[PDB]
């Protein structure tokens, strides 16, 4: 399990809640 705003992991949470890239 894991929930960090609701990504896949790594993607980050931009200022419109799409699970972006962190790279």
Known sequence: ???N???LAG???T???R???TF
């Open 15 to 17: 200022a419109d809640g």
């Open 19 to 21: 699970c972006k890239p």
């Open 5 to 7: 705003g609701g990504c």
């Open 11 to 13: 993607y980050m949470r």
């Open 1 to 3: 399990e894991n929930f």
